[PDB]
Design a binder for these strands. Structure first.
Lengths: 326, 319
DNA sequence: ATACGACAGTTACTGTCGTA
DNA sequence: TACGACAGTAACTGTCGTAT
């Protein structure tokens, strides 16, 4: 059959580039195949590539392939070249010209490394596909994706040196302040997560207001424990508040849409027996949450926390008087 | 054991050795498996490697098959695929990850291991703020027909579980796929006129038809995408907003529509022209401005607004 | 020629369980 | 771990034809 051998030669790919070895669990997690069949694939890949090295990492053996597969399995396929540029174009069409420029550069190198003769062959079908699909563009402020602002910032955190720049807003606009670069979070605007000097909690800043950029030659590292994605998932979006358990009651009117809906990274989607759906999660940013609570109209009732009652009826009198409801 | 997967790759190993073509009458001997199964191996590789060509010397067949980027590139490709896997977009992620693999594979060691520790320094110095909305229903298979029928220019007979006529199959011209709230297939019910959009959630028991259905020479999927602000294609109203003086900054650098024009003021406000339908979806986006917005044109925007406002207004005791 | 199917019969497909 | 084995059960196999 075909389906069975596809997933094998894809695992051979997963090991051909790890360069440290993804252990049997880390090699069979991207497949969810199972233990013993994963080891059977280990021998099928050895019976495919007897140069595949096993290396220890007690308490486990990590496996890698050091010398590349056959070129048959390395030169990319149509849908993958296509899906690279549909996303790179999506960035170009979301004002994110730098994030795109990098992926475009990839595509260029990815095609000159294809033998010229074969490129012309499946150059067109790529274009057919990229035309055929399109990604939505929801409405949200233009991303402040300037390379010079991102050249200093992907390098301040590289040498782990500090950085001082001029920002506008907050309680004190204009203060050219020095901070601890952690990483950039791409969102509605573009935001940089960083910390002032020492002491406190990592504040928020919008790239749109960055001038006087220098790579402050005064090294300063972060708290080693900290992954930026963890700080990301704190809030329901951007605004960082006192993190809040929330629980929502969805009518049956929108039951089966609530099942496949995605509120937060910490969802608790278990259905009431009587048709409703109760959803609990935990994050800050309770106003942006009310904004998403418009989308459901009369199909959800804020049950807890009762701070959402305040924020919701707040924004329904804030946009209700200015429109002509009450 | 596990023979089926390993004995097959050794077929593509010779389809890359030939460059002139091997026939079933040969391959069935160079594998010792027999002809009727050799006739299935070709189909298998053709499903993996459409690059396999069939040089035909009458009256038999023959068969043959025909970098070093910056950390920045790799980390950006990675973070993209991750923001895909974090959205439920399984089909579009699975491919960006595969593309990272196939070029990591083709890198020499002392460099592929020299910049392997550098990728993740970046991959955790950025992460993308995934947004609330349904999981895009992307199953490799129920988009696989659609790609075949767009390449082969064929038609797509598919059952549909929604839209006032659910239960039986119906033919359309496969025109495009718009990835949005959910995932969408825009098609022409019949031919001529304007396109109607179908949610992929409710399309199953598809089949590509050997009755090739050609699309018009002059259709633009991005245009139709713009035709409705957001998703559902209402009438195209000429939309006209005024944003109060405060949120000019984000308005001036906002992106309401692809056919939008941001005209500033003198009194303090900002004037907004654009043109597309979707009154509900836009009343939603205008809730996220509060009271800095005065709807001018059309009149149905005001209505859809007050409709979907007091619907929650009496629902949440705020009125 | 090859594509291509139906149809008994077989022997790999899982997951689970054992010892050196 | 690197390893078989258990049936338990769906796919793999090859005789046999149809189909230009």
């Amino acid at each position: 059959r075909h389906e069975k051998a596809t997933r094998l030669l894809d695992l051979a790919r997963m090991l051909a580039g790890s360069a440290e070895g993804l252990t049997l669990d880390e090699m069979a997690a991207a497949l969810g195949v199972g233990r013993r069949t994963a080891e059977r694939m280990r021998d099928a890949v050895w019976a495919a590539f007897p140069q595949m090295e096993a290396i220890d990492d007690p308490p486990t053996k990590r496996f890698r392939i050091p010398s590349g597969l056959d070129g048959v399995f390395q030169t990319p396929t149509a849908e993958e070249l296509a899906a690279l540029r549909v996303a790179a174009d999506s960035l170009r069409a979301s004002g994110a010209d730098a994030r795109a420029s990098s992926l475009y550069a990839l595509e260029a190198k990815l095609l000159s490394a294809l033998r010229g003769s074969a490129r012309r062959r499946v150059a067109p079908d790529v274009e057919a596909l990229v035309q055929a699909e399109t990604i939505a563009v929801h409405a949200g402020p233009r991303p402040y994706e300037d390379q010079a602002v991102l050249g200093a910032i992907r390098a301040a955190i590289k040498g782990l040196q500090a950085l001082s720049f001029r920002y506008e807003g907050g309680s004190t606009p204009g203060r050219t302040r020095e901070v601890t670069p952690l990483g950039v979070l791409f969102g509605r605007s573009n935001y940089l997560v960083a910390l002032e000097g020492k002491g406190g909690k990592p504040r928020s800043w919008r790239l749109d207001r960055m001038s006087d950029l220098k790579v402050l030659d005064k090294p300063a590292p972060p708290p080693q424990d900290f992954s930026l994605q963890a700080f990301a998932d704190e809030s329901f979006g951007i605004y960082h508040d006192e993190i809040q358990d929330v629980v929502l009651r969805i009518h049956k009117s929108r039951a089966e849409d609530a099942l496949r809906w995605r509120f937060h990274a910490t969802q608790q989607v278990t259905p009431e027996a009587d048709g409703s759906v109760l959803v609990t999660f935990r994050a800050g940013g309770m106003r942006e949450l009310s904004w998403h609570l418009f989308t459901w109209g009369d199909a959800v009732e804020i049950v807890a926390p009762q701070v959402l009652k305040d924020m919701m009826v707040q924004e329904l009198r804030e946009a209700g008087r200015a429109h002509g409801a009450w």
